């Protein structure tokens, strides 16, 4: 973020890895996979 309330007590931030960033076309495929119509197994499996 940029403006964090003080009562949250935020000291460090975990930044985004290069590997967590997807090209949009590529993400939009995984999204439809997980939106669950076909199967919800992978969104509640951990």
């Amino acid at each position: 973020m940029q403006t964090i309330p003080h009562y949250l007590q935020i000291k460090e931030i975990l930044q985004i890895s290069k590997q967590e960033l997807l090209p949009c076309h590529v993400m939009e495929q995984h999204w439809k996979f997980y939106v669950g119509r076909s199967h919800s197994e992978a969104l509640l499996s951990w």
Partner: protein, 125 residues
């Protein structure tokens, strides 16, 4: 014990989506779990419309819900939510699973969250 214009749900797990490289790509979830040594995942919505996930003193996500329709898409399925962002052209995904005494307790608290979320942005079911 914080002021009454902040709502917090504790969470059981949180997961950042990421691509992994095959050496000789394939997908997986980078996973954070609520823990005594590790501190407590909490989701926090202030009434400004600011959203935070955090564990101990570590910020994990932080952005503003207001006017997040073009770039932010949220989806529920039982006691989990899924978040999809699409800022600039880059995109990412994270998910959270809420916590409670029973699968119904957690579900109760999840749904509570989406109602507070539903104040500011649409969330699918």
């Amino acid at each position: 014990g914080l002021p009454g214009e902040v709502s917090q749900w504790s969470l059981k797990r949180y997961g950042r989506f990421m691509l992994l490289d095959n050496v000789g790509g394939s997908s997986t979830w980078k996973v954070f779990e609520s823990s005594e040594e590790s501190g407590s995942l909490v989701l926090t919505i202030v009434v400004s419309g600011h959203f935070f996930i955090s564990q101990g003193q570590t910020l994990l996500e932080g952005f503003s819900l207001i006017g997040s329709k073009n770039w932010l898409k949220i989806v529920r399925r039982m006691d989990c939510l899924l978040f999809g962002t699409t800022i600039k052209n880059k995109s990412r995904m994270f998910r959270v699973q809420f916590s409670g005494e029973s699968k119904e307790e957690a579900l109760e608290r999840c749904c509570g969250c989406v109602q507070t979320l539903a104040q500011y942005v649409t969330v699918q079911e």
